[PDB]
Every structure is written in structure tokens, then in C-alpha cells.
């Protein structure tokens, strides 16, 4: 079917962090757009934090970064940055979590996916999109109508 793409809500996985900070630091800052943050994504960059080889530490480092990032932002309350759970709640503070996911990732996606009978009362909105370079995640996504980007690309696009 033909979507209309207006994008919203986006989503990031956790290579996202790890690669491209600094990028979703400059979307989140704009305004424009609603950074939702599957919870297993956090979970993910933890165990990445808490861990070695060489290349470990230095992603352990960019992961350790990354929740800096995100719990310094969730502290302030931050209006344009949302974290979702497994069951589709919206956490507004990641604080004291406990504590391969692409289905949990889709399914936060999805979650921002309002379809109701009476839509089709024609064009299938959607103003979420996810954010990966995961060529199996971005396969499917493709395959459940979720807008998908890497994230360099959408930052071109959105030109902020």
C-alpha cells in the first residue's frame, strides 16, 4: 500500500549510539522530533558500559557515553526524548532500570502505528521512523510498512 511519511517519532537501535551519537544528539536538540528509545536498547548499551580487548573498551567507552547522554537528558525530563518498555509504556525517567532484540525494536515502531478501520475510510500515515545502518532490521522493517533511514541520511534530510 502507499504510505504518507511525516516523520515524528524516531527510533534508534543501539549501533545507533555507539556509531552516531553525536547525530542524534543534533536531532534530539532541534525540536523538531521525538527521540523514542526502546528500553531494550538502554539495556543493550549497559551491558556494553559495564563490560578486554581493544575494541571493546572502546565501544564500552561510546556505550558509556551514550548513557551519560540519555540519563542526563531524562533527568531534565526532556520533552522530546521518550523511552518505551517491552509492553508499549512510556518510561519518563530510565534512572533506576534494574535490571538480538530487532522484534522489540519493530515493536516499539510500531507501537507510534495508529491504524483504525476508519483511516481507510487514501494514503497508510505513518510518522515514525526507524533509525538503523542493520540491513536485516531495515529489511524488516521495510516488510511491516515502517519508515526506515540510517541515520546520516535522515540528518541530512531533516537539515538541523
Not at 21 to 30: F, G, P, T, V, Y
Not at 57 to 80: G, H, T, W
Request: hydrophobic fraction near 45%; include cysteine; charged fraction near 30%.
Amino acid at each position: 500500500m502507499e504510505l504518507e511519511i511525516r516523520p515524528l517519532f524516531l527510533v534508534p537501535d543501539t549501533n545507533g549510539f555507539i556509531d552516531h551519537l553525536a547525530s542524534l544528539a543534533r536531532l534530539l536538540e532541534s525540536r523538531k522530533y521525538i527521540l523514542v528509545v526502546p528500553l531494550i536498547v538502554i539495556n543493550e548499551l549497559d551491558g556494553l558500559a559495564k563490560g578486554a580487548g581493544g575494541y571493546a573498551r572502546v565501544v564500552q567507552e561510546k556505550a558509556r557515553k551514550s548513557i551519560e547522554f540519555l540519563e542526563q537528558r531524562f533527568e531534565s525530563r526532556d520533552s522530546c526524548l521518550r523511552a518505551l518498555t517491552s509492553r508499549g509504556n512510556e518510561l519518563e525517567s530510565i534512572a533506576f532500570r534494574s535490571e538480538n532484540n530487532d522484534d522489540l525494536i519493530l515493536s516499539c515502531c510500531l507501537h507510534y502505528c495508529k491504524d483504525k478501520a476508519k483511516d481507510f475510510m487514501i494514503r497508510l500515515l505513518r510518522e515514525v521512523v526507524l533509525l538503523t545502518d542493520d540491513r536485516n532490521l531495515r529489511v524488516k522493517a521495510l516488510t511491516r510498512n515502517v519508515p526506515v533511514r540510517d541515520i546520516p541520511a535522515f540528518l541530512t534530510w531533516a537539515q538541523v
